[PDB]
């Protein structure tokens, strides 16, 4: 991501699941990282949601509230048809913040 270049997207095969984003990251684009002009809905991976992994935030990684969508800039650029955009990695962010 623009805020977290050291992140690793899942890039898994798409499923039939609809994801949700954390309330703190409400409205943020999953790929474009923008805040306006959404086009398409976000599809979660099959393994990306199974029990405890169900209901988590796509980008924020926390408990989701609202249903997310792909940014229109990402949809027109043929970017929304990619793999599962689940943030599997968690590093270089919120690591030492718990220490503070």
């Amino acid at each position: 991501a623009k805020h977290h270049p050291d992140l690793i997207f899942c890039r898994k095969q798409a499923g039939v699941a609809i994801g949700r984003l954390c309330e703190k990251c409400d409205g943020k684009c999953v790929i474009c990282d923008s805040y306006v002009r959404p086009c398409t809905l976000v599809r979660i991976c099959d393994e990306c949601n199974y029990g405890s992994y169900q209901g988590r935030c796509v980008i924020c990684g926390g408990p989701g509230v609202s249903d997310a969508y792909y940014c229109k800039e990402c949809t027109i650029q043929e970017k929304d048809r990619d793999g599962c955009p689940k943030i599997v990695n968690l590093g270089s962010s919120k690591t030492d913040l718990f220490y503070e």
């Binding site: 798409a14 499923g15 039939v16 043929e78």
Partner: protein
Amino acid sequence: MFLYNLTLQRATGISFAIHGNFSGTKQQEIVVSRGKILELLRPDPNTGKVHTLLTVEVFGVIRSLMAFRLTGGTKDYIVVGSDSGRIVILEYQPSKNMFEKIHQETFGKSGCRRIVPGQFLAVDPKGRAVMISAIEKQKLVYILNRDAAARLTISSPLEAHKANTLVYHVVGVDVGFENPMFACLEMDYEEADNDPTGEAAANTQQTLTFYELDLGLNHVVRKYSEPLEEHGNFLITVPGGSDGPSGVLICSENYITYKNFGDQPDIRCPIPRRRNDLDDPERGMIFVCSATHKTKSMFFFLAQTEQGDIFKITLETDEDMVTEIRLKYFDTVPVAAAMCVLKTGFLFVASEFGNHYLYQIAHLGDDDEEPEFSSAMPLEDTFFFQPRPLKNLVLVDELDSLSPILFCQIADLANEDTPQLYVACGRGPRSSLRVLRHGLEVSEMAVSELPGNPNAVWTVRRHIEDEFDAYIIVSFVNATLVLSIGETVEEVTDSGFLGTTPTLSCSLLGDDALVQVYPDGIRHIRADKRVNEWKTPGKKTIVKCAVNQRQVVIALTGGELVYFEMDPSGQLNEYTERKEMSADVVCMSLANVPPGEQRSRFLAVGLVDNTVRIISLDPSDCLQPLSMQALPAQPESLCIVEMFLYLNIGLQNGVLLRTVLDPVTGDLSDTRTGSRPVKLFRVRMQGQEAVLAMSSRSWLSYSYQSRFHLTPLSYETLEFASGFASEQCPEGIVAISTNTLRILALEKLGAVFNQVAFPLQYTPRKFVIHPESNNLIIIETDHNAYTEATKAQRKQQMAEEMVEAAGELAAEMAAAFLNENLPESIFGAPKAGNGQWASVIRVMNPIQGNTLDLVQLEQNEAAFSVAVCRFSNTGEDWYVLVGVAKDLILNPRSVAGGFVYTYKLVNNGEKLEFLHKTPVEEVPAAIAPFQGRVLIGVGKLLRVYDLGKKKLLRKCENKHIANYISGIQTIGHRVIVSDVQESFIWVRYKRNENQLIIFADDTYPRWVTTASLLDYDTVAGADKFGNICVVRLPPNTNDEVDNGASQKAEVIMNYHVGETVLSLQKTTLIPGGSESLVYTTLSGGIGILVPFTSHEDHDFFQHVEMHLRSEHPPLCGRDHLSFRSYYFPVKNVIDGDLCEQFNSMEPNKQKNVSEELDRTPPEVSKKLEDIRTRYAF
């Protein structure tokens, strides 16, 4: 140049085909998939006529079409594989007549990528799963499951990525509720990718990989792998379970192999060949297509070969294994692209070129003298086939669908003003020069001369239960006659009219009661022998009348009208009022009693003072005016009809006015039907009521997919009209012409254009119009074939070879091979050759169908271009220059030499003579005039030659061409040269110095296939990749001259045509309209691009497109911006095809569009119809 796309004729070619009960009823439907449009057909079981039940533009590249039927259902889904990575499962909606998207799931990126699934799509037999596979490195398996509400839920897909595995095809295995399996003909490419010696490239055999989708493991796995002897071409799943055994029959070059699963062995059967066939021995045979007739008793397959000979495969099955493969010559069919064996004994065979076919399955393949070649029958040697005509099939109908339109010329080649579109399409024996004309062909059932001066015609039935016509009244100038319609048309007098004078009207008043009106008065003749007459009080003459289902209005002189009501007991009650109009009535209109109402609400009356008025016919406002309407001309007639109704009125001029039906008059529309009076009558066709015209042309307007549309009838003018119906005549027009009768009928309800072709021998290349003779010279050239003299030489050689066998020598069978020449069009053209080709010059009468002149080239020759023009040094001798090439080849290793035969074309433009024969250098592909000289393209050289004594003296040469001269457009001073790999280039030819110099070039390249001169600096060109562009030179172009080149031009127009266009000569279509660019397509479509003459109109169209992009998107999941910008981006092109969905859009979508546009939905409809009326026919 803001152009607007307009599709006049949709694509008729069939690319994919499926057959099944998709309508959810007992009827069997046929789903056809063209290049960019889907269609659903429900042909007549009894009538045997194929009607286009539904046609919807997919807005995408339909690459695969496979059906689906869930377990325990009675309605089949439709899997639509597109160029996009979205797998779509749609379902029919006959209640709304719209294709409903049941499920849509994204799989990958866009574009027909190698790693993009869409090249192969399969559905299992159990209906439990579907599979999508790309050309390589992709395989997804989607699971279908029934919901509690019977909602087909698409589960997540299974990943089956197999690297370095190229999939040749896919098919479903047979499983009776067990672990299903899917078969694919895979080929490994990774091993040969690391073989510099080239050895591992060979010994790389394709293998049948059967992957099992374990329902328990929920993951695909390589279940079985089985190599084959040679590479295959197609697969067919033998149905298993309770019906037949499991297995997959694979066709390969001169072989068909049944190798089922388990311990079953491989059974082989070679492909037969034609006995003493003139084809090449090195050319093998492959299964072009195959269908299966699954029955509860047994199952057979019908497979078409490369030569079109449809063979009948029967799977001889043992107790638990395959016994043998029984093949038999079923029939001889054309080059088959798809085959569907539907119920009720029907076989829909769609060819890759030419009209479709729909035969009746009469013989089951057995009980005949034809032999059955079986896999157990040894041979060493192939079983020679004895072809014959259609013995087991009968051709019921033929779906025209004019496909490959190689060339096109839209001009008044005939003596008429309505220009004809001479369009050549076909493939060798399937040649057809269709002179398309915008109209409707009325099948003349019968015609009979009427004496005197016939004035009017009407047709009244016998009773309410009568399913056919009973009486036909013909009002002469001084009398009226009646005829009884009972398959015995003769005189009739016992009807009860007593009309010794001309009658003003005659119809069926009640369920069986007749109501006649003559100038003497009215006469009600009930079902019994009774005729209640009612005289006209006073000297006022009956001016007009109008009947209804339960009401009858009469109009005398001075605007004195009278009403009559049909009582429930059959009594005719006279109106209790004397309604006086503003003036005398030129005509009146009255609607029919609907099912719910007992009479009409409003009734129309037009005065002689050019004004119409509708008055309430109800009792609350009886004889009360309701709404006025302006008439700028003398009203000629009036008519109202349903389909949501409308009111039409023909004026005294050659034009008419239509408006919406309501308590008041709404919008207004007009079109010149005209140079004749606008007469109108009622008719009923296609299960819909409509208005039949009577003017200079019979414009027959009817609803066409929720949209009014009208074309004229291709016949003489009609003076009076009425409907006729019987057992022989389902629904037709009984019409009175000038002293003649005509019982015509037009079933073709597909509003488009009618045509009749003049076929040829070889496939066409181009056309040249003879100006003085008004003839047409077509260059018939087809490669991979032999000449007629070549065929004779080969036949003589084969005859000598057969006679050299000395087989009791005494076998007098060679005469049958020498004399009995099978039909090249019916039994196929036995042609071959890797480099052998053939050409033929032909000049034929366009109005006629005869070839006035024919000329044959050599056997090793091949034509590429032709033209006709006069020489500057010569007089009025319009010479025909035709270029051809010898020893050519599709592979990149052919040139040999080029020849430009100099045809004389004399004797009143009807006598060709190739005097001069100047030889070319490379491969000639162009010839045109320029300053009286002949500008020709010799490869990468432009030669301006002058017609000499021996050969065209090359008076000037230019060597600036990049790859090869693909097109040459001769401007007044410049010349547009379009290369094969490079874009257009404008070159100026200084005549004083005699030097050609490239004036500029293009920025983006395009494989130009055709071209057109738009203006003095604008040039339009197609693209081999399916694009159409328009380059306009700037004002600063240095016409005087002395990254690649100096001067460059800009791209002023860009739009994806969707289908490969190959002809563009936009000029003037419907006379009185604005000129436009008519563009053809290789898939049988003729569209028209026209400009937006208003910035406000451009903004309105842009807003409409921006709204429709999100309101009513396509079903294939492709985006309009992507569907239009596939090869190159869009540049000022408004896709009117997507705009046409506003008429078919839902009501909520219509309201949303009207709100976003700040106008009415009928406002948008009128705005859309205005462009079609102004710029098209």
